[PDB]
Every structure is written in structure tokens, then in C-alpha cells.
Amino acid sequence: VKPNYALKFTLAGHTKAVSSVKFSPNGEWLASSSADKLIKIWGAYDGKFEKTISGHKLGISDVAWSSDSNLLVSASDDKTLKIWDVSSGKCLKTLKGHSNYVFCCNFNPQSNLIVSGSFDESVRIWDVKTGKCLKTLPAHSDPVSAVHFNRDGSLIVSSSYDGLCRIWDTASGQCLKTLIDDNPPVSFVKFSPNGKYILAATLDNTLKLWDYSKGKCLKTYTGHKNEKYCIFANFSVTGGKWIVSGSEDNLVYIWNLQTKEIVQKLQGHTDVVISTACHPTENIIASAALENDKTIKLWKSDC
């Protein structure tokens, strides 16, 4: 009925606010990015520090894994993304074209494409092999807070401070849907793993589950604090079905997906929990916090 997530490891190393944490698809590794301009790789199960990857000229707001767990892409205030070979630590490509901070990024499931969102208000689609920008979408009228591919890579969902979520055809770049509620800034969005929903965060302390085909809100989740930061949210589906999110009161919130009831509040961080990630095969949550904390935490549950 309720999970029992408990703190197992605290990962210290970044010297500035952590921005994003992500588990590799194969479940072996955790990648973290930070305002200290570094990417760090840790063991997903024991939190053991593995290596530091560097190269960006300014700090990093997001990092994301390719489907084979070999490549990373990062989004930086230096207006570029970088594609990394994790095993070598090498920067393979630097993706140039955005005219302002790059804020969010993701590979498609095939991992031949990368999608990025920027303060320049555009979404760009990049070729992984060549590093070339294939399409620039005039996606929003304000910073783009999140971008994500669906299960088969045919769709992209984007969110922005303009208050909109938009669904894009990957192949043509056509906007297929604009989601409009009864218009607070949208600070995060992603497709559900089964592909039938998107989960959207807005800066009015609200998470919303949408049927993006019907353009209808199914569930809402509240009780947490989120008015200032683009905090990652997740579907947890390895055990029970939960929604997981960070919060500006320093807690990790966990909701029952169906009933919308808060089932757990994880205490430990000493600053805003900017990022949470759910492990692909096991009941494990990674969380990370901002400047006054700078640590990453691994929590484990029996369901």
C-alpha cells in the first residue's frame, strides 16, 4: 500500500549546486551534473564514486543517457550541449546553435537523435553521429524547461514558462498538440514509461497527469513546494505505482499515482531537492540538492 524508502548512501563530491541526476538504462551507473561544470559517475547500487568528466566552460543544468548506457549528453550555460563517451571520459561532439543557456536534454530510444531546450525559447533536434542540428522548432515564447521523447521516439514533449506543454512529431517537426489548462509556468514535463500520459510540473506547487491525446487532465498531485525551480518528477513503476518529485522544502515527495495521496516524505537534504530519478529495475530513488547541500542521496524500498 505504501513504500518504505530509507536512506542508504550519501554521495558527496560536487563543490556547487547539483542540477540533475540520472540512472543509466542498464541500472549500473548514476550520472550527476552540477553548476561546478562537472559530470560525475557513481555506482547506482553502492554510490561509489567512479570518475569525473569535464569540458564545459560554464555550469551544467541537465545530463541524459543513451539507451545503450555508453553515451551522455549535457546541457550548459555556455550555450552548448556536449556528447560524452562515458567509458573514455571524452567529449565526442559539441552541439552548437542555441543562442542562450541550454537547460534540458534527452536522447531518443534509438539514440541516434538528441533533443534540447534552451532559454532562447527553441527546441532543437540533433544528429548524434554528426553532431549537426537537424531541426530548430519555434517551440515556445519563453524558456524551454524540459524536453522528452516518447517510447518509440516518434513524439517529443516540451514545456515552457509560457505555460504550455506541446507535443511534436519528431520526423516532421510539426506541432501536434498544445495543452492548455484553465497558464502557470510549466517547469517540467515527461512521458510516462507506458507512453499513454505526460506528467507536468507547474510553478504553482502542482504536478498534473495528462492524457495528451484527449488534452485532458486526469490526476493532480499537491502538498509539496514548487514555485521557483525546475524540479524533476518521475514515474516509479518497479514496485508499487508512485509519482516521485523533489520539493523546495528539502523533502522528496512520493504520491500514490492512482489515489493521489502522499505516501512518503523523505527527509535528509538541507536545501531544495532539484532532482530525483527512479532506477530502471529496482526500487531505488536518487535525489540531489542545491547550493547549501550539494549532496546526492540513494534511497531504497521493498516496494
Binding site: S19, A35, F103
Partner: peptide, 14 residues
Amino acid sequence: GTCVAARTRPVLSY
């Protein structure tokens, strides 16, 4: 001065 990232700064709405 180079250790800056947009996600780690709050939104400025006023």
C-alpha cells in the same frame, strides 16, 4: 565566475 547553471537559480518573475 564560471560555475553557473540556469537550473540552480530560481525563476525571476516580478
